[PDB]
Amino acid sequence: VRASLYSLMVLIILTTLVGNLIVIVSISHFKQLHTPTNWLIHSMATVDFLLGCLVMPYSMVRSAEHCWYFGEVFCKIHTSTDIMLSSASIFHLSFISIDRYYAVCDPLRYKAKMNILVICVMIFISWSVPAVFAFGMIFLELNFKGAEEIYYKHVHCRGGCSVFFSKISGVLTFMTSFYIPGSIMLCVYYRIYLIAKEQARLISDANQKRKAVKTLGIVMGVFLICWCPFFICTVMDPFLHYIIPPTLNDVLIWFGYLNSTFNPMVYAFFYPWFRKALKMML
Amino acid sequence: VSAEDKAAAERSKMIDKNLREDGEKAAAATHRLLLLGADNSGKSTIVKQMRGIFETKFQVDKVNFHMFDVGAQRDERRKWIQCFNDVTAIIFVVDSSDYNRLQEALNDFKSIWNNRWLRTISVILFLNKQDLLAEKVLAGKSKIEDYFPEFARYTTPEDATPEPGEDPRVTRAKYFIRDEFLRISTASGDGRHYCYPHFTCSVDTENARRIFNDCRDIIQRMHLRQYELL
Amino acid sequence: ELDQLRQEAEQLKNQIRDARKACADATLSQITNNIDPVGRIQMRTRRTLRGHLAKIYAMHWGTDSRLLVSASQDGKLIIWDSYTTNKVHAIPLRSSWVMTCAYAPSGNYVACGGLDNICSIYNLKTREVRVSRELAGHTGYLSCCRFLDDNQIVTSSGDTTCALWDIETGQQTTTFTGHTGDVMSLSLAPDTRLFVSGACDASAKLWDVREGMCRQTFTGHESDINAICFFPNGNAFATGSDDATCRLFDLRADQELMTYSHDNIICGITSVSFSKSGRLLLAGYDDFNCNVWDALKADRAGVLAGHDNRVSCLGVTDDGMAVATGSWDSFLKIWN
Amino acid sequence: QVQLQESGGGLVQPGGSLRLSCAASGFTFSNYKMNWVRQAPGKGLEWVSDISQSGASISYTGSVKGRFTISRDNAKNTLYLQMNSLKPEDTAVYYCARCPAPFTRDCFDVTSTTYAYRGQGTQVTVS
Amino acid sequence: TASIAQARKLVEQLKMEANIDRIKVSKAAADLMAYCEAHAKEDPLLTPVPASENPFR
Ligand SMILES: Cc1c(F)cccc1[C@H]1COC(N)=N1
């Protein structure tokens, strides 16, 4: 029923909100957790908190009621903020992956290559480039610049207002928000997995003379299962004449939100240095 | 709120700032090594180039290494070695030629390994005087079986890589010393540290590169363990 | 020629132990069974003092109960102001391997020392901090040094000998030998006439500063002694050892009084210090926190948990307003 | 006081046996890893045997492996070292020096020239 | 002969320790009790101080 479905969405929203709030206050408060990696994680948690407090509550209304209950300009701002925060979260994931690639494959020249200056550059890129791309495209109206009649027909067929992507804009938003950061994470999680297996094998052989699997599986599986379906279906729609049902779009969108729900878990709670630190204050 | 209070607060601010730049300039891209061993070993001759408590700062590839050599304190070292509880590694040096002190070298190694404060400190084990070991075993006047009865039932490892020129007895002896050290190394390891054997000579020049690669592996494994990848 | 002297030493030791047994009429625990308990003495971290970039090895409260100096392996010798959390000074140490530090009773001086085997004196109050003096001559590392005044300093060393130095003159005026192991800590008496020191031979010996030789030697511990501090009355002191036991020895009784240990505690003590009254025997163990004892009851009466790494130093102000514990987590916490 | 008084030993022809024992007082013997370091005349101190806190882990120096045997009796507070089939090179003074810390396996500094917790010594002469 | 000199020094130190007027342990316990009772209300840690008087608020 609509009530049960809205209960599901509100449970997801409270979960992501509280998780990212715990992460934000934990890195902000505790002095020992002021590492540049912790600052990337804190900025990502801020992205997810802003997403869950500024987009997900209204995506709830657009989901349960199947119709927009707000203003049109408010709808453009909402789509703007959704796209920016989602691309910001994915950029933060990719930058944390680059951080760990340096920490693993260049352990010595690590603190001299990944310091507060470079982190803050990464945070600026993860907050501004999504902002520029998303806000500029959607507001200067490039979402469907070059294909107007089909867009008008689609927005008049059903729905108060939904995110509409043309072929060019769809490919651009894909290869800007999911693919390039996704490919970066894939390549810097595959190399790290190779390094970690090789190191684990060497230790085992010395002794006789796979925690990484679990960890990298959790990370990459959460990211892929929570983003890749939505993005592939979004890309197919311009090329498949907009055939997928709106409920499928709803499920994909809230999987994309579940990624930000599970980010404070995967990237903070998983590692022991955070579980113990939180227990100091809790 | 007073002028003196404002001056004190400003002074605290500049002191904190100065501490900040000093720490970021010192601790960045630097690693501290505690060098141990005995007098007869190549204790001061491990790293031939780039030379109370001694010191030796050398760089391999843009990375700074401070190699401390305590050589002024009394014999009882159970206390002052607690200060080196953060060093990246310990450059243990062994006089492989003289078997008489080699047993107390093992005792020192086992005490370092099992120490509560040196627990998470890897050891870059430098089996030194390999040439002297070679001449001793070729002469055959002193047999390692006398100092260790386990040499009789020992066998050379299959993974061992003979050098272009080496007698099989030389290889068996040197790898027997190496395995005798790794026995203690692998007995009580919490996985927080590992021993890295490296057969070295007084004329070898690649000791700095060996320490660089070994410290790179140590820090890489520590990072993997911290990030739960190991 | 040696067996006869060994037999003589054995019979003197037998005489000493027999005299101690005769004087041991009743233990303080047996005489205090009727004392009301102190109760749970909870303490909260009042002013955390962060800013050290590495492990903190020692500290010494000021005689004004406001300025505490801390020595750390980072190379700094900061002089904090607990009232305002203001680093008055940040002395750069030539040798990062500091192991102890001290604050002059007047306040005009501060000292350090460590594996460099040199006690470096500093003019904390200078007209222009420079290296005031570089007292050298010990063979082993410096474990603990204290100021008798602005001109005399007693520094314990790892060469089993603690010596008395004339700061301006520059050499050891008096050397207090006798320990068979490395001396690990020092404690000056309230009247500044005697000083005891536990060493790496489980023995604490009482020296007269002027007379120059050991007066009383107490052997009650099992392992290396790491900390020591007189009772406020000046007739007793407590010693922390690696055997996880604080032990109250009294100078007049010439023998043990109490034992502050339990089966639960296994980590040894790195720093102990009496309170203003002497009713409390705050000690710092290796198990990442400190325990507050009760000297009269020998019963633990509180804890000081809150430090991330091992606690290395611990000191109480002269007026006993608050205790500051410095641990390996690079943080100083004042526990009032 | 932590005192270690040794007993046994003496004079014996090669191949003989002389069980060495030493009474331990002043500490909880059952909590300290034990040792049997020796000192030969004209040579530095040499560590001979070893035992664990509960007697489980036992190690011997190579020159006397098998011939000697250590054993610990917690109730008796005595450390027992059985030397059978002695050799002329065994002539030395034997110390049943424990190691300073309790509840630990690392006996860091035992064979030092001026170790605090070492015994008086037993001169065993084999000729 | 430095060994016999060290033994003689140890003997002298031991007999210095021997000829010491050791008071009764009961007297020592009573003295410590009296000191603690006299300084009972003077110790901020033993008797907690009000926050107004407390300089570490
Ligand atoms: C509309 C859009 C994009 F163009 C790119 C990433 C994310 C989104 C929204 C919809 O789906 C979710 N979770 N956010």
Coordinates of N, CA, C and O in Angstrom, one line a residue, chain C residues 6 13 180 200-202 219 221-224 242-243 266, chain D residues 1-2 26-28 32 98 100 102-103 114 116-117 120:
Chain C
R6 N 81.4 -12.5 51.6 CA 80.0 -12.8 51.2 C 79.3 -13.4 52.4 O 78.1 -13.1 52.6
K13 N 72.8 -9.0 56.3 CA 71.4 -9.1 55.8 C 70.4 -9.8 56.7 O 69.3 -9.4 56.8
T180 N 72.8 -1.6 41.3 CA 73.3 -2.6 40.3 C 72.6 -2.6 39.0 O 73.1 -3.3 38.1
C200 N 66.6 -0.5 38.0 CA 66.4 -1.7 37.3 C 66.9 -3.0 38.1 O 67.1 -4.0 37.5
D201 N 67.0 -2.8 39.4 CA 67.3 -3.9 40.3 C 66.3 -4.2 41.4 O 66.6 -4.8 42.4
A202 N 65.1 -3.6 41.2 CA 63.9 -3.8 42.1 C 64.2 -3.2 43.5 O 63.5 -3.6 44.4
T219 N 64.4 -3.3 49.5 CA 64.3 -4.4 48.5 C 63.0 -5.1 48.8 O 63.0 -6.0 49.6
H221 N 60.5 -5.2 45.9 CA 59.8 -5.4 44.6 C 60.4 -6.6 43.9 O 61.4 -7.2 44.3
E222 N 59.7 -7.0 42.9 CA 60.0 -8.2 42.1 C 60.7 -7.9 40.8 O 61.6 -8.7 40.4
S223 N 60.4 -6.8 40.1 CA 60.9 -6.5 38.9 C 61.4 -5.0 38.8 O 61.5 -4.4 39.9
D224 N 61.7 -4.5 37.6 CA 62.3 -3.2 37.5 C 61.4 -2.2 38.0 O 60.1 -2.2 37.8
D242 N 57.6 -2.9 37.2 CA 57.1 -3.7 36.0 C 56.3 -4.9 36.4 O 55.7 -5.5 35.5
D243 N 56.3 -5.3 37.7 CA 55.5 -6.4 38.1 C 54.1 -6.0 38.5 O 53.4 -6.8 39.1
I266 N 47.7 -6.4 35.3 CA 48.9 -7.1 34.9 C 49.9 -6.2 34.3 O 51.1 -6.5 34.4
Chain D
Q1 N 63.6 -9.7 49.1 CA 64.6 -9.4 48.1 C 64.6 -10.5 47.0 O 64.5 -11.7 47.4
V2 N 64.8 -10.2 45.8 CA 64.9 -11.1 44.7 C 66.3 -11.7 44.7 O 67.3 -11.2 44.3
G26 N 61.6 -14.1 46.9 CA 61.3 -12.7 46.7 C 60.4 -12.4 45.5 O 60.1 -11.2 45.3
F27 N 60.0 -13.4 44.8 CA 59.1 -13.2 43.6 C 58.2 -14.4 43.4 O 58.5 -15.5 43.9
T28 N 57.1 -14.2 42.7 CA 56.3 -15.3 42.3 C 56.9 -16.0 41.2 O 56.9 -15.7 40.0
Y32 N 57.6 -16.0 36.0 CA 58.8 -15.5 35.4 C 59.4 -16.6 34.5 O 59.7 -17.7 35.0
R98 N 66.6 -15.4 36.0 CA 65.3 -15.3 35.4 C 65.3 -14.1 34.5 O 66.4 -13.5 34.3
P100 N 63.5 -10.1 33.6 CA 62.9 -9.1 34.5 C 61.3 -9.1 34.4 O 60.7 -8.8 35.4
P102 N 57.5 -10.1 34.4 CA 56.5 -11.2 34.5 C 55.4 -11.1 33.4 O 55.3 -10.1 32.7
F103 N 54.8 -12.3 33.2 CA 53.7 -12.4 32.2 C 54.1 -12.1 30.8 O 53.4 -11.6 30.0
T114 N 76.2 -7.4 34.1 CA 75.7 -7.0 35.4 C 74.2 -7.0 35.5 O 73.5 -6.1 35.8
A116 N 70.7 -7.8 37.0 CA 70.3 -7.6 38.4 C 69.8 -8.9 39.0 O 70.1 -9.2 40.2
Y117 N 69.0 -9.6 38.3 CA 68.2 -10.8 38.8 C 68.9 -12.1 38.5 O 68.2 -13.1 38.3
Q120 N 73.9 -16.3 42.2 CA 75.2 -16.2 42.7 C 76.2 -17.1 41.8 O 77.2 -16.6 41.3

